């Protein structure tokens, strides 16, 4: 559920993304696809939760006479009951859905890192800080090909094989 390592204050163009470091320099670059899906989903969720709470026409209070006391306590009970029900619903939905929003975001992290895992199996080495070191040279074009999900494993398979075996 909870999938966190650390945050990037320098990536200012999206919820999720990449930090690339090659011989052409380093930089932050947001993944617009997963960030976009997340914004769509969260917007629809928020709008659904809010817009379901619609309003009727009920001047709330009533004031009854001295021969309508039990009538009056019933009406105050109804007011307070609708109060408590709507308060209860709002509180619990906010709690639950904040939990679920954070968990959804964690799973988005996990899915992005899985995608980069899949494009790059043995051509790179995974690190416990949730990163990859290429066994080959990944230039800007290679980086972009990984970012838009079009990396070419056989393209660098031989170079990565050579360097990977070279480590040992």
């Amino acid at each position: 559920a909870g999938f966190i390592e650390g945050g990037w204050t320098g990536m200012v163009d999206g919820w999720y993304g990449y930090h690339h470091q090659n011989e052409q320099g380093s930089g932050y670059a947001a993944d617009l696809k997963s960030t976009q899906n997340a914004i769509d989903g969260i917007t629809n969720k928020v709008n659904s939760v809010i817009e379901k709470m619609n309003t009727q026409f009920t001047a709330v209070g009533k004031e009854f006479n001295h021969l309508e006391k039990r009538i009056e306590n019933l009406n105050k009970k109804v007011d307070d009951g609708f109060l408590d029900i709507w308060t209860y619903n709002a509180e619990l939905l906010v709690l639950l859905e904040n939990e679920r929003t954070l968990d959804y975001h964690d799973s988005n992290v996990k899915n992005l890192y899985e995608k980069v895992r899949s494009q790059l199996k043995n051509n790179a080495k995974e690190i416990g800080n949730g990163c990859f070191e290429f066994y080959h040279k990944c230039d800007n074009t290679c980086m972009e090909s990984v970012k838009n999900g079009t990396y070419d494993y056989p393209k660098y398979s031989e170079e990565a094989k050579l360097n990977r075996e070279e480590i040992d």
């Epitope: 320098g10 200012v12 163009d13 930089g27 769509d40 969260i42």
Partner: antibody, heavy 121, light 108 residues
Amino acid sequence: QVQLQESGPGLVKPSETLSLTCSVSGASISSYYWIWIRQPAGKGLEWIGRFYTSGSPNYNPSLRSRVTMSVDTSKNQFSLKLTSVTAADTAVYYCAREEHITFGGVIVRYWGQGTLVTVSS
Amino acid sequence: DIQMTQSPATLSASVGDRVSITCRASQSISSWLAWYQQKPGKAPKLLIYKASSLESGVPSRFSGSGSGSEFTLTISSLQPDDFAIYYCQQYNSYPWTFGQGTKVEIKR
């Protein structure tokens, strides 16, 4: 409030490298992407491109190599450089700041003055 | 990438009249359209983001309705100051492209 002023020559000869400088007051360049915008005559706007200090630039696929965007964190400016300007490259230029993430995606609230670049001998 | 049809190119409408500008797209934009009021010879002013989000300081007469490929900007009561050229921007993907713009005049 952040202010963006624009400096351009006014005339660029038809086979020269246009150099434009947007000066930034009230903000640090190293913290924002910076955007260039273009308007030929009174027809439609066109997003030129985006650049960031510790990030990766992206420009219009229409204008890729000709365009190089650079940043002076010293002078608090960012410059746009266009190789081999043309008559079609005659237009108004605007520089804008790319804001950070909001719930409505990335916004461009802050806009430059607009400077005319004329490509004439 | 994404070509922009902004109809109609030129309008003239009396004061108080509702005005509707349609912005159709090449592919799917979800709700990632922006709307700018470029007054004559000035910088464009962002009217609406996220398609259905009014920016702070904008009169509530401006409303934005649409998702996917079709969108409409609607001015509830057209006022004198609302004479300008109105563009619809796309930030769903790069390159960000604008519409040709709609020229809003006022019949008097």
